[PDB]
From a paper:
In order to function, collagens require the specific chaperone HSP47 for proper folding and secretion. The arginine residue is located in the so-called Y0 position and forms a crucial salt bridge with an aspartic acid of HSP47 (16).
While homotrimeric procollagen molecules, therefore, always expose three potential binding sites per such a triplet, so far invariably a 2:1 HSP47:triple-helix stoichiometry has been found. In these complexes, the two HSP47 molecules bind to the leading and trailing strand of the triple helix, while the binding site of the middle strand remains unoccupied due to steric reasons. There is no space for a third HSP47 molecule on the middle strand of the collagen triple helix. Although the complex of this mutant with the collagen model peptide Ac-(PPG)2PTGPRG(PPG)2-NH2 crystallizes in space group P21, which also has not been observed in any other HSP47 crystal form so far, its structure is virtually indistinguishable from the other structures of HSP47 in complex with various collagen RGP model peptides of different length.
Residue numbers in the entry:
A (entry chain E), B (entry chain F): 1 to 14
C (entry chain G): 1 to 13
D (entry chain A): 35 to 367, 375 to 413
E (entry chain B): 36 to 366, 376 to 413
Write the structure that this text describes.
Amino acid sequence: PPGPPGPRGPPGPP
Amino acid sequence: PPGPPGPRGPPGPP
Amino acid sequence: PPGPPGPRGPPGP
Amino acid sequence: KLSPKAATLAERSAGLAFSLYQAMAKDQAVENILLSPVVVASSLGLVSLGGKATTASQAKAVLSAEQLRDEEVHAGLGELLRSLSNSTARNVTWKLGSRLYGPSSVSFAEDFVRSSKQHYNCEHSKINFRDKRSALQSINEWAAQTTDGKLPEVTKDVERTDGALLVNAMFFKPHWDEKFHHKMVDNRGFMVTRSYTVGVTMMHRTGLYNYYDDEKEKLQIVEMPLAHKLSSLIILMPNNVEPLERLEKLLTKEQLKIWMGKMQKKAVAISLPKGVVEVTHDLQKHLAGLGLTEAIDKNKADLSRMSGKKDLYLASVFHATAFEWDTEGNPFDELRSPKLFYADHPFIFLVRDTQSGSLLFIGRLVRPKGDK
Amino acid sequence: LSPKAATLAERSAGLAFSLYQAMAKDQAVENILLSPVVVASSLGLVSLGGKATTASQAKAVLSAEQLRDEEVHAGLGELLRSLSNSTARNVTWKLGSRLYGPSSVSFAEDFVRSSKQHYNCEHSKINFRDKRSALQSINEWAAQTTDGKLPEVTKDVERTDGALLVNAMFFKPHWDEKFHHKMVDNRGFMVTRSYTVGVTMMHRTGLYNYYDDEKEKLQIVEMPLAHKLSSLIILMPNNVEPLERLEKLLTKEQLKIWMGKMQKKAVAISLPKGVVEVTHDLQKHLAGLGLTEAIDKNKADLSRMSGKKDLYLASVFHATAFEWDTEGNPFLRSPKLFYADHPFIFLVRDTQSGSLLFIGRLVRPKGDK
């Protein structure tokens, strides 16, 4: 089976 | 196989 | 393995 | 299933539950929420059983059961309490204890002890805050014994000491109809807010779940069936990191019916925090806001049916729950593109008895355990 | 390595920082891609074929005054040949150096032998009367040197009556721990906060030496190359911003401080995938460092190259194709994100001799808005 989802992406720019 | 990509990151600081 | 990280977030307020 | 009197009280406890949830969610001091509708109704039922005059009528006031007699309220809540408590044993781990702590000068009336134990399985104990730490330890030892250490502590302090304390200790562990694999577990970040992240453990599984994606309201909702489909756990979550206030404004009994009707079995990759969430509420202030004003008043409480004298007032109503998110469940059994339900930010959850439709739990997870 | 090759490894690394800083201030330079040892070899060629101040200025920019001409050529030769074959087993590395002289010019026989013995330097004759035919010979040779990975050096040659030193390179880091060839997707590279280019990125999570400077808001990570003989170090601001501030902190001693503060942590590294092609004419920038007379038609003394004083250093072409790929050797807390979707600085460092194999910055990948 497929692995886990990746982590959440980094925050956006200010 | 590798899992799906993670969700989009949070918004940046104000 | 875990997938890639998600894309970068939107800009702040 | 249940008797006519238990079914109508089930629908009223559910309306009272959503209703109590919203009041606590509007409280800027409340973070995590975790309420059992039947335990909350039983707490009000105990006040009506041991109260007189306006103290008892206000208890039936919050319950929306004035037009019911005292006997059919206790018999209805009693059946509803015992029915849902064991209709959700056979499937998931579920431990409930209710103990009423009175001051040492108080003597519980014999008729109240018998009816409160028969209807609500209420235990009665006497406590003295002479040694305030020893008194707190007695409560925490009782809660740990009731929950087998899963809830080792109710409260760290008791502000009101000269009254009666109603303590409900609970442990609930959902047993999934399709288990997560114990190796699909790693360390990730839970974003309590956009600026505050707590390190937690997460469990991951991809499968077929009832799912609805609201592009208009920008929210996800998923139904996770519990063991043997006797109950289900429903999760409501915004698409991105944001406070749950906006989603709670949509959280009504009628809007939920629309979401439940729009769900379709889709491939969903569910990622949940793993661990025990410990939530202790003192429903005293929030039950007072709903109408239970005199029972908690030192100067106007009439709880003479509990003790024979007007020496008691409702000091606290502790609703303490240990809710464990774990991978364990039933064993289960291939090219779909899974929807991502990534629960790394605050969400709302409901536990629903699929048979009677009764609300077993309502709550929200804002802050898991973790050192950040 | 020999004592003289070891001292040249430390000074070519110092030359890299000094050369990098000069180009970063040049508003015409975007991407930077420099091989310090190849740059040092170019200065060695000027010292080998120059006389009087032309040759001494070459050892000045090289900071190799305490070494004589004899030990500089032999040292750089070993250092170049060491890194050429000590890294011919881990990473792919193709290097060519050719010296183009005018057709009326005849390279002296001793210079051809010594420059090929020490620097593996090739020698050719050209005339830019037909400018397109001359450009093709340089570009055909570079494509041959890199097997098509670098099909082009320059589109034009402004200085025609002098000598052209052309370095053609292809470098492809081979990771000690490979990326999964399916862990590749298309993302946006923010050149600035107002300009995003579509690029391909490769993703991997693992244990890497990492340092997070919260005060300066920058991340630095060490990615070991195949069999741990070298490392690729990346310096990047936390969010997208011009590299000018970070370049001001980029010194040889500050790098030692940052590497000394690193700890192996779980890091999720996301890098652009693809070939970066950069061609520099180091002539202008080497003069700013002290190599002034070699590039001057009226005072260059390169008589040891050709027998006549008709030659000056017209251009020093430093052309590199640098491929970011997933391939490498086959191979836990909550990983830090090293998400390289905005300009960054990178260095490839030979961990043994301490020699800096590459220093550069990626500001603009290939793609469309």
